[PDB]
Amino acid sequence: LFELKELRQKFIFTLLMFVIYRLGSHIPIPGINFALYDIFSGGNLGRLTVFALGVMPYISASIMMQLLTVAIPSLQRLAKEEGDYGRYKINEYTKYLTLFVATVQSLGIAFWIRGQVSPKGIPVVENPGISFILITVLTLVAGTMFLVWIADRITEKGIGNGASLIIFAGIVANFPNAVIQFYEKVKTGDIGPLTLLLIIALIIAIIVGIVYVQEAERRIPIQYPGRQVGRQLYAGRKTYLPIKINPAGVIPIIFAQALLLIPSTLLNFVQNPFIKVIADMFQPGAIFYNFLYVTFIVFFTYFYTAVLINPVELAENLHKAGAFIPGVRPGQDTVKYLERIINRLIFFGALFLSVIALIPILISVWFNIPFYFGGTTALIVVGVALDTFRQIETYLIQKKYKSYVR
Amino acid sequence: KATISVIIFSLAIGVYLWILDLTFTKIISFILSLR
Amino acid sequence: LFVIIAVVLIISTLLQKGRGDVGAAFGGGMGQSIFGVGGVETILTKATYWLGALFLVLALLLSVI
Amino acid sequence: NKMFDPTKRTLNRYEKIANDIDAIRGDYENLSDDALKHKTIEFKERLEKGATTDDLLVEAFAVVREASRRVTGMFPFKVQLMGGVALHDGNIAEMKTGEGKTLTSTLPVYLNALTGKGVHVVTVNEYLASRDAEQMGKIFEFLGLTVGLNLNSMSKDEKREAYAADITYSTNNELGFDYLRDNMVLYKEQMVQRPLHFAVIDEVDSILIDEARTPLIISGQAAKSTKLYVQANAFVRTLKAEKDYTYDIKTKAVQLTEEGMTKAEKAFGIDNLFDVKHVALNHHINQALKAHVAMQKDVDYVVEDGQVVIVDSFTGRLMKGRRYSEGLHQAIEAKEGLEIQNESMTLATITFQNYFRMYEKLAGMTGTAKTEEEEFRNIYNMQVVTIPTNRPVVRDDRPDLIYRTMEGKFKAVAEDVAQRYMTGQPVLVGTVAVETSELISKLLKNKGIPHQVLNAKNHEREAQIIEEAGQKGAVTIATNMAGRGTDIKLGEGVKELGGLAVVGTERHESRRIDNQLRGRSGRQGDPGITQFYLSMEDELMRRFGAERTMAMLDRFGMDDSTPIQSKMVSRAVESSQKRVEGNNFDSRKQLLQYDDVLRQQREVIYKQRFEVIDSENLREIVENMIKSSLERAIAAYTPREELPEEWKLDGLVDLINTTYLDEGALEKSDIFGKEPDEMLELIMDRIITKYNEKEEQFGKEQMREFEKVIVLRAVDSKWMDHIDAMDQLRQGIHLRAYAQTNPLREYQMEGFAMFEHMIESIEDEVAKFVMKA
């Protein structure tokens, strides 16, 4: 039928993943289960953790390399060796790096949580056994391993981020099932499911941004390590042209969004947490803070991400940009040509992503809902979803040509 | 466009989450409940 | 008790696990890289993987009655 | 259980196998003459197949080693015996000196070949193809076989008999070209390689190093040729007009700043904004600029009055007429004097994984390094069997004595060679290139010292020199191209002090290679001496890792004399060596990975060409697809923009462009609307089949052949043509690194879309062509 079974792998990773995860959350010792905002969220520092330490070290790992390489490009001899040589070395560094960071988060979350959190079965006999401190450090470090080990394997079949999407699948799954989404509203919150249709509208919008603001140039060289390189004037007939430009990466909004959550978090749970109603730092400050998301994720990422260096390698290996009118001037001047496109397109991107969080915000004018749960989770769920589409896209279509049909 | 089918797929993929989610809750609870 | 030595083991299993990934790195890691071909077989290290998953659930039973 | 445990585990495995076989050798010594000949007939009859008769290997190898004893000599060592065994397995035994190599290869070569398939023996260079080919030869006639080696222009006999023959000796570069030779071939009688599976690699450390693909490109019909001649003349001179600050380093790419832009306006092309749709002119300037700079004409030397600009580069040793690129060959010609017309492409392949992995296994000899095993996994899937023969590493090797600021160090090395000469020590040097080598000898001349230079000056020289280099007090200088893998032997008494001497001009692009040039002293298991002289100014470091070396030294200390290597000098450089090697690895991956997806596209393409050559009446199929493709074209209509729509003017119009031929068939005929595919297909198909046979009238014999030339040339043409486009696609990968992920994603997409487009196109053209006469 539609499935056109072939992929031996597809169901395999899927089923396998489900088994590992169920146990992972229920896990004894931790299993703290949760983000929403403050009350719904949770955590000692401010990390929504479905489970004790794993997604956190992931974000940590990513961020560790990200900012470090960013502000300081080359601390020690590895910007990029040749891309691969530079990359593998880089990844190995990332593995150990994130690993240790996870440990730090381990003890801290352990201490705060065990001591004073909403209903927790956790018994206390002295530091019962090896301390929830040393013992939880055990589950936290060891825990880091079972998830990490799982993630890597997941990386084999599903993905490095397949594991993440599953997290989304679960959370995102939890609410539509109607676990607890029938409550506050003006005698509503159960009618107006048009909201479901409308969210659908949201899905179509998402696909639009990621096609990439796309566009590119020309020329191909190849240098084998050695004395020489080659060149070619012309020949061949075919379609297909070069495409360089891009759109914002996977969860940028979430990265910036979290920054906002930091000041807001303090405000919801200060010592003797004052839910300042007068200054509600759940929602009220939100407009200002949300703009903060825009500046940090969009602008700063785009600068480094855009890799200021680009005109060099390009202009260097003889290139004249191609896009929206025949390109021309090389050199730095071209970075100019590109610079305009990158920040410009990013403004466009801001319009959509910001529109996401904004979207429940726009609608909630007439009858607001205390059940915000959704939105961001979608941006992520779809994100990995489209990503998996990538896996199928390449994987799919075998040799069509010697089909049975001539 | 491709997107229309992507949405149909999106529903399909979601079906998996609902379905897989059921398994997790089922098996996971199994360990706690039985033992 | 069983658990007491086991806890010493639990940290231990953590260490072997940590190393496996670094060595595990030739193919890649965080994010992605390239689908190296030639493939992978079940690594000899996989025993550590099997031991881990078995181990955590074991803890679940042990952690409680 | 991955560790020494595996290598060691290997030891007993062989130690056991060897004991058994060793017994076989013992009883056998009763001079089995004719009886042995019967053995050759008995064994030959024995396998007759890939069955991998192991038992035979024991009795057969024994006959081999003994066969050698009868033949000549070179048969008493182990790492070789064991060598053939692991070899049969597909790994790498050995390390050099004594060991085997000569005899080693012969052993597994004998058993496998018996299949009657013919076996491949990867050898680095043609001079070598002759080497092992003859050295081992006696056991062959003994064993009653037909050896067979290939060479750049020829093997004295022909290609057909050569491969089909028993043993197939040759150089990879050639083996690739032969394999490819298998494309345009209008016929199939051409024995051009009988299928290619198995191969043992002599000096495997190279079988990997061959990064850049193996492309065979002959046919270049340049429309532009007259223009290029005059035009290029002007072009190169223009760049000459410009000065040094062009900035060209670390890569083959080049462009220039202010003077550059200014120059561009300075010469024809007042237009400041040159880029818009007029890069082509710029293309000419960059061409010469790169040519005059990137590869010294002296790399690309011209033989005495040969006037043929020949490229010796890439670890070669003078390859007659050819060029890596479309722009360069002509560019340098503009520099020299006789200018050529050609610039052509055809086909390309990964020498190793695409080729070897395309079919069967490999087992190399020598290099034991750590660096190769990962490679041996990713592409090949082989391992390493490290084994020292009698008295390991009997030779001594001294450190990389360093010297600063300029090649002046080589000057000091000169006096060094002299002192050796006085002591009566036969020396040899492995220089970097042609120019430096020559200058090197010139120095010896200033000093007045005898010597032979085989820096690819003349091939014949390589011959004389082989027995010649190292004949008591002798002095030889040669390029690394001559510098790797040779069974050299010192005359008598020569070894009296030190034994052999080797001095290197610097440290090559890879760690192994540096070692290789060194390894060139030590056969049968004797002593020798090696030493390297490097300069902070030489090459490896001049461009690579220069940035760091400066601080490391300048902060460390400027003042001193010539010799130094106290504080991390040799240490640091070594790190850079791996570093540079690393770059190779990275570039290795890019073309390797892409070419992999190419391996599949390519397979369908010529494999299809094979089917066409073999079968006679494609007729029903070709028309059918031509129609189904054409009709579906008229067919594409569905709800959408609808490419066609079988209606009236809509189809009539698009279909007309779809069927634009001087021929006439119902073109004008409108008003219709019997779309069930039966109707549309029958009408066009009839005009074809009918006209086909009507056309067929010309001749049974002659006509059959037409699809030959047409199908292959036309099909072949389109693909090679779209292959050039394939080059451009590689540019797209250049792009992938930024934006999306990096798995060769964008490339894969495009590879297919390009190719479905490619074939449909084929049916169109190949079809219409069948008509004209």
PDB file of all heavy atoms in Angstrom, chain D residues 257-305, unseen atoms left out:
ATOM      1  N   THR D 257      44.010  40.450  -4.669  1.00  0.00           N
ATOM      2  CA  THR D 257      43.396  41.625  -4.115  1.00  0.00           C
ATOM      3  C   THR D 257      43.538  42.811  -5.025  1.00  0.00           C
ATOM      4  O   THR D 257      43.266  42.732  -6.221  1.00  0.00           O
ATOM      5  N   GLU D 258      43.980  43.956  -4.458  1.00  0.00           N
ATOM      6  CA  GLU D 258      43.958  45.227  -5.128  1.00  0.00           C
ATOM      7  C   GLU D 258      44.670  45.193  -6.443  1.00  0.00           C
ATOM      8  O   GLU D 258      44.092  45.544  -7.469  1.00  0.00           O
ATOM      9  N   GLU D 259      45.931  44.741  -6.475  1.00  0.00           N
ATOM     10  CA  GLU D 259      46.630  44.750  -7.725  1.00  0.00           C
ATOM     11  C   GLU D 259      45.888  43.806  -8.617  1.00  0.00           C
ATOM     12  O   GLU D 259      45.869  43.950  -9.839  1.00  0.00           O
ATOM     13  N   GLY D 260      45.277  42.769  -8.027  1.00  0.00           N
ATOM     14  CA  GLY D 260      44.595  41.822  -8.856  1.00  0.00           C
ATOM     15  C   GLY D 260      43.446  42.465  -9.576  1.00  0.00           C
ATOM     16  O   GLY D 260      43.360  42.403 -10.802  1.00  0.00           O
ATOM     17  N   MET D 261      42.552  43.148  -8.833  1.00  0.00           N
ATOM     18  CA  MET D 261      41.401  43.734  -9.452  1.00  0.00           C
ATOM     19  C   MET D 261      41.928  44.737 -10.407  1.00  0.00           C
ATOM     20  O   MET D 261      41.462  44.826 -11.544  1.00  0.00           O
ATOM     21  N   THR D 262      42.963  45.479  -9.977  1.00  0.00           N
ATOM     22  CA  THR D 262      43.450  46.527 -10.813  1.00  0.00           C
ATOM     23  C   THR D 262      43.953  45.942 -12.086  1.00  0.00           C
ATOM     24  O   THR D 262      43.698  46.492 -13.154  1.00  0.00           O
ATOM     25  N   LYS D 263      44.653  44.795 -12.017  1.00  0.00           N
ATOM     26  CA  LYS D 263      45.190  44.173 -13.199  1.00  0.00           C
ATOM     27  C   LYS D 263      44.067  43.795 -14.106  1.00  0.00           C
ATOM     28  O   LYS D 263      44.140  43.990 -15.319  1.00  0.00           O
ATOM     29  N   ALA D 264      42.971  43.280 -13.523  1.00  0.00           N
ATOM     30  CA  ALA D 264      41.878  42.824 -14.331  1.00  0.00           C
ATOM     31  C   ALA D 264      41.414  43.978 -15.163  1.00  0.00           C
ATOM     32  O   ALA D 264      41.164  43.823 -16.357  1.00  0.00           O
ATOM     33  N   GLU D 265      41.289  45.177 -14.562  1.00  0.00           N
ATOM     34  CA  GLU D 265      40.917  46.296 -15.381  1.00  0.00           C
ATOM     35  C   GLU D 265      42.079  46.700 -16.233  1.00  0.00           C
ATOM     36  O   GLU D 265      41.895  47.192 -17.344  1.00  0.00           O
ATOM     37  N   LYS D 266      43.314  46.503 -15.731  1.00  0.00           N
ATOM     38  CA  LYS D 266      44.468  46.987 -16.430  1.00  0.00           C
ATOM     39  C   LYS D 266      44.531  46.385 -17.791  1.00  0.00           C
ATOM     40  O   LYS D 266      44.942  47.047 -18.739  1.00  0.00           O
ATOM     41  N   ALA D 267      44.139  45.109 -17.940  1.00  0.00           N
ATOM     42  CA  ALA D 267      44.206  44.523 -19.248  1.00  0.00           C
ATOM     43  C   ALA D 267      42.809  44.324 -19.693  1.00  0.00           C
ATOM     44  O   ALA D 267      41.941  44.223 -18.831  1.00  0.00           O
ATOM     45  N   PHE D 268      42.607  44.209 -21.037  1.00  0.00           N
ATOM     46  CA  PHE D 268      41.359  44.187 -21.765  1.00  0.00           C
ATOM     47  C   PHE D 268      40.245  43.794 -20.849  1.00  0.00           C
ATOM     48  O   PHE D 268      40.202  42.675 -20.342  1.00  0.00           O
ATOM     49  N   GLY D 269      39.260  44.700 -20.667  1.00  0.00           N
ATOM     50  CA  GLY D 269      38.293  44.473 -19.630  1.00  0.00           C
ATOM     51  C   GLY D 269      38.293  45.615 -18.654  1.00  0.00           C
ATOM     52  O   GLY D 269      38.503  45.446 -17.454  1.00  0.00           O
ATOM     53  N   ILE D 270      38.029  46.823 -19.187  1.00  0.00           N
ATOM     54  CA  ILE D 270      37.928  48.077 -18.492  1.00  0.00           C
ATOM     55  C   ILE D 270      36.827  47.954 -17.479  1.00  0.00           C
ATOM     56  O   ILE D 270      36.771  48.703 -16.504  1.00  0.00           O
ATOM     57  N   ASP D 271      35.870  47.049 -17.746  1.00  0.00           N
ATOM     58  CA  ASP D 271      34.724  46.849 -16.901  1.00  0.00           C
ATOM     59  C   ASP D 271      35.140  46.488 -15.501  1.00  0.00           C
ATOM     60  O   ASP D 271      35.720  45.428 -15.257  1.00  0.00           O
ATOM     61  N   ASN D 272      34.843  47.391 -14.541  1.00  0.00           N
ATOM     62  CA  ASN D 272      35.149  47.170 -13.153  1.00  0.00           C
ATOM     63  C   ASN D 272      34.359  46.003 -12.664  1.00  0.00           C
ATOM     64  O   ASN D 272      34.919  45.046 -12.132  1.00  0.00           O
ATOM     65  N   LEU D 273      33.026  46.033 -12.860  1.00  0.00           N
ATOM     66  CA  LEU D 273      32.251  44.932 -12.365  1.00  0.00           C
ATOM     67  C   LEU D 273      32.300  43.854 -13.395  1.00  0.00           C
ATOM     68  O   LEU D 273      31.426  43.719 -14.250  1.00  0.00           O
ATOM     69  N   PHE D 274      33.381  43.061 -13.314  1.00  0.00           N
ATOM     70  CA  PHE D 274      33.701  41.982 -14.201  1.00  0.00           C
ATOM     71  C   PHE D 274      32.796  40.806 -13.990  1.00  0.00           C
ATOM     72  O   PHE D 274      32.437  40.107 -14.935  1.00  0.00           O
ATOM     73  N   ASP D 275      32.388  40.576 -12.732  1.00  0.00           N
ATOM     74  CA  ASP D 275      31.718  39.364 -12.355  1.00  0.00           C
ATOM     75  C   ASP D 275      30.465  39.132 -13.140  1.00  0.00           C
ATOM     76  O   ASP D 275      30.201  37.999 -13.537  1.00  0.00           O
ATOM     77  N   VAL D 276      29.664  40.173 -13.422  1.00  0.00           N
ATOM     78  CA  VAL D 276      28.390  39.849 -13.999  1.00  0.00           C
ATOM     79  C   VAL D 276      28.504  39.174 -15.335  1.00  0.00           C
ATOM     80  O   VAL D 276      28.899  39.756 -16.342  1.00  0.00           O
ATOM     81  N   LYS D 277      28.140  37.881 -15.343  1.00  0.00           N
ATOM     82  CA  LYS D 277      28.023  37.086 -16.529  1.00  0.00           C
ATOM     83  C   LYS D 277      29.250  37.235 -17.367  1.00  0.00           C
ATOM     84  O   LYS D 277      29.187  37.075 -18.586  1.00  0.00           O
ATOM     85  N   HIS D 278      30.406  37.541 -16.756  1.00  0.00           N
ATOM     86  CA  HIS D 278      31.555  37.649 -17.605  1.00  0.00           C
ATOM     87  C   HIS D 278      32.748  37.108 -16.887  1.00  0.00           C
ATOM     88  O   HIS D 278      33.871  37.549 -17.117  1.00  0.00           O
ATOM     89  N   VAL D 279      32.535  36.100 -16.030  1.00  0.00           N
ATOM     90  CA  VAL D 279      33.580  35.479 -15.269  1.00  0.00           C
ATOM     91  C   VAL D 279      34.486  34.754 -16.208  1.00  0.00           C
ATOM     92  O   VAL D 279      35.659  34.523 -15.912  1.00  0.00           O
ATOM     93  N   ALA D 280      33.954  34.385 -17.387  1.00  0.00           N
ATOM     94  CA  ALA D 280      34.667  33.538 -18.300  1.00  0.00           C
ATOM     95  C   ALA D 280      35.996  34.149 -18.607  1.00  0.00           C
ATOM     96  O   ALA D 280      37.004  33.447 -18.660  1.00  0.00           O
ATOM     97  N   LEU D 281      36.049  35.475 -18.812  1.00  0.00           N
ATOM     98  CA  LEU D 281      37.303  36.105 -19.102  1.00  0.00           C
ATOM     99  C   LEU D 281      38.198  35.917 -17.923  1.00  0.00           C
ATOM    100  O   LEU D 281      39.354  35.516 -18.058  1.00  0.00           O
ATOM    101  N   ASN D 282      37.652  36.150 -16.719  1.00  0.00           N
ATOM    102  CA  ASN D 282      38.421  36.025 -15.519  1.00  0.00           C
ATOM    103  C   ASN D 282      38.947  34.630 -15.496  1.00  0.00           C
ATOM    104  O   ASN D 282      40.056  34.381 -15.031  1.00  0.00           O
ATOM    105  N   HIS D 283      38.166  33.684 -16.037  1.00  0.00           N
ATOM    106  CA  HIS D 283      38.554  32.309 -16.005  1.00  0.00           C
ATOM    107  C   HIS D 283      39.883  32.198 -16.690  1.00  0.00           C
ATOM    108  O   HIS D 283      40.783  31.524 -16.192  1.00  0.00           O
ATOM    109  N   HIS D 284      40.065  32.885 -17.833  1.00  0.00           N
ATOM    110  CA  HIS D 284      41.309  32.734 -18.533  1.00  0.00           C
ATOM    111  C   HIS D 284      42.452  33.217 -17.691  1.00  0.00           C
ATOM    112  O   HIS D 284      43.493  32.565 -17.647  1.00  0.00           O
ATOM    113  N   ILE D 285      42.294  34.355 -16.982  1.00  0.00           N
ATOM    114  CA  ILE D 285      43.401  34.895 -16.245  1.00  0.00           C
ATOM    115  C   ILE D 285      43.777  33.950 -15.148  1.00  0.00           C
ATOM    116  O   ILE D 285      44.941  33.582 -14.998  1.00  0.00           O
ATOM    117  N   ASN D 286      42.777  33.462 -14.395  1.00  0.00           N
ATOM    118  CA  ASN D 286      43.070  32.592 -13.306  1.00  0.00           C
ATOM    119  C   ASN D 286      43.749  31.383 -13.854  1.00  0.00           C
ATOM    120  O   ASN D 286      44.687  30.886 -13.235  1.00  0.00           O
ATOM    121  N   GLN D 287      43.340  30.918 -15.056  1.00  0.00           N
ATOM    122  CA  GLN D 287      43.907  29.718 -15.604  1.00  0.00           C
ATOM    123  C   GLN D 287      45.400  29.857 -15.655  1.00  0.00           C
ATOM    124  O   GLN D 287      46.098  29.198 -14.888  1.00  0.00           O
ATOM    125  N   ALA D 288      45.917  30.836 -16.420  1.00  0.00           N
ATOM    126  CA  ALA D 288      47.339  30.954 -16.567  1.00  0.00           C
ATOM    127  C   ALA D 288      47.950  31.172 -15.224  1.00  0.00           C
ATOM    128  O   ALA D 288      48.902  30.477 -14.869  1.00  0.00           O
ATOM    129  N   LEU D 289      47.328  32.055 -14.409  1.00  0.00           N
ATOM    130  CA  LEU D 289      47.871  32.450 -13.144  1.00  0.00           C
ATOM    131  C   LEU D 289      48.138  31.202 -12.374  1.00  0.00           C
ATOM    132  O   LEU D 289      49.254  30.983 -11.907  1.00  0.00           O
ATOM    133  N   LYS D 290      47.146  30.305 -12.298  1.00  0.00           N
ATOM    134  CA  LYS D 290      47.342  29.072 -11.602  1.00  0.00           C
ATOM    135  C   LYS D 290      48.423  28.296 -12.298  1.00  0.00           C
ATOM    136  O   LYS D 290      49.324  27.781 -11.648  1.00  0.00           O
ATOM    137  N   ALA D 291      48.411  28.213 -13.643  1.00  0.00           N
ATOM    138  CA  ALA D 291      49.363  27.351 -14.293  1.00  0.00           C
ATOM    139  C   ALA D 291      50.774  27.777 -14.016  1.00  0.00           C
ATOM    140  O   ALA D 291      51.546  27.029 -13.421  1.00  0.00           O
ATOM    141  N   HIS D 292      51.105  29.043 -14.310  1.00  0.00           N
ATOM    142  CA  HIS D 292      52.453  29.509 -14.169  1.00  0.00           C
ATOM    143  C   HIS D 292      52.911  29.307 -12.755  1.00  0.00           C
ATOM    144  O   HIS D 292      54.106  29.176 -12.517  1.00  0.00           O
ATOM    145  N   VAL D 293      52.012  29.472 -11.772  1.00  0.00           N
ATOM    146  CA  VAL D 293      52.345  29.319 -10.372  1.00  0.00           C
ATOM    147  C   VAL D 293      52.269  27.947  -9.738  1.00  0.00           C
ATOM    148  O   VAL D 293      53.243  27.443  -9.185  1.00  0.00           O
ATOM    149  N   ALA D 294      51.080  27.312  -9.819  1.00  0.00           N
ATOM    150  CA  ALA D 294      50.708  26.149  -9.047  1.00  0.00           C
ATOM    151  C   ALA D 294      51.591  24.984  -9.310  1.00  0.00           C
ATOM    152  O   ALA D 294      52.013  24.318  -8.365  1.00  0.00           O
ATOM    153  N   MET D 295      51.886  24.686 -10.587  1.00  0.00           N
ATOM    154  CA  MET D 295      52.739  23.572 -10.827  1.00  0.00           C
ATOM    155  C   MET D 295      53.844  24.087 -11.673  1.00  0.00           C
ATOM    156  O   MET D 295      53.623  24.495 -12.813  1.00  0.00           O
ATOM    157  N   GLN D 296      55.079  24.064 -11.132  1.00  0.00           N
ATOM    158  CA  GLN D 296      56.171  24.615 -11.870  1.00  0.00           C
ATOM    159  C   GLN D 296      56.246  23.835 -13.131  1.00  0.00           C
ATOM    160  O   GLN D 296      55.990  22.634 -13.142  1.00  0.00           O
ATOM    161  N   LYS D 297      56.605  24.514 -14.229  1.00  0.00           N
ATOM    162  CA  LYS D 297      56.626  23.897 -15.512  1.00  0.00           C
ATOM    163  C   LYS D 297      57.542  22.718 -15.401  1.00  0.00           C
ATOM    164  O   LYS D 297      57.400  21.736 -16.126  1.00  0.00           O
ATOM    165  N   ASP D 298      58.512  22.813 -14.477  1.00  0.00           N
ATOM    166  CA  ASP D 298      59.514  21.822 -14.197  1.00  0.00           C
ATOM    167  C   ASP D 298      59.009  20.591 -13.484  1.00  0.00           C
ATOM    168  O   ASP D 298      59.805  19.693 -13.206  1.00  0.00           O
ATOM    169  N   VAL D 299      57.765  20.611 -12.963  1.00  0.00           N
ATOM    170  CA  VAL D 299      57.104  19.445 -12.421  1.00  0.00           C
ATOM    171  C   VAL D 299      56.522  18.638 -13.552  1.00  0.00           C
ATOM    172  O   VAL D 299      56.447  17.409 -13.516  1.00  0.00           O
ATOM    173  N   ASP D 300      55.968  19.393 -14.512  1.00  0.00           N
ATOM    174  CA  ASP D 300      55.304  19.186 -15.772  1.00  0.00           C
ATOM    175  C   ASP D 300      56.288  19.149 -16.909  1.00  0.00           C
ATOM    176  O   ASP D 300      55.944  19.590 -18.004  1.00  0.00           O
ATOM    177  N   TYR D 301      57.567  18.847 -16.628  1.00  0.00           N
ATOM    178  CA  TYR D 301      58.707  18.883 -17.512  1.00  0.00           C
ATOM    179  C   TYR D 301      58.415  18.417 -18.919  1.00  0.00           C
ATOM    180  O   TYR D 301      57.365  17.851 -19.213  1.00  0.00           O
ATOM    181  N   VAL D 302      59.316  18.785 -19.862  1.00  0.00           N
ATOM    182  CA  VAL D 302      59.248  18.336 -21.225  1.00  0.00           C
ATOM    183  C   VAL D 302      60.504  17.575 -21.509  1.00  0.00           C
ATOM    184  O   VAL D 302      61.606  18.064 -21.265  1.00  0.00           O
ATOM    185  N   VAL D 303      60.374  16.352 -22.062  1.00  0.00           N
ATOM    186  CA  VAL D 303      61.545  15.564 -22.309  1.00  0.00           C
ATOM    187  C   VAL D 303      62.309  16.234 -23.404  1.00  0.00           C
ATOM    188  O   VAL D 303      61.759  17.061 -24.131  1.00  0.00           O
ATOM    189  N   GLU D 304      63.613  15.901 -23.520  1.00  0.00           N
ATOM    190  CA  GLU D 304      64.492  16.564 -24.444  1.00  0.00           C
ATOM    191  C   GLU D 304      63.873  16.594 -25.808  1.00  0.00           C
ATOM    192  O   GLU D 304      63.718  15.576 -26.480  1.00  0.00           O
ATOM    193  N   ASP D 305      63.463  17.812 -26.213  1.00  0.00           N
ATOM    194  CA  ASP D 305      62.889  18.127 -27.490  1.00  0.00           C
ATOM    195  C   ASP D 305      61.656  17.319 -27.723  1.00  0.00           C
ATOM    196  O   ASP D 305      61.055  17.392 -28.795  1.00  0.00           O
TER     197      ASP D 305
END
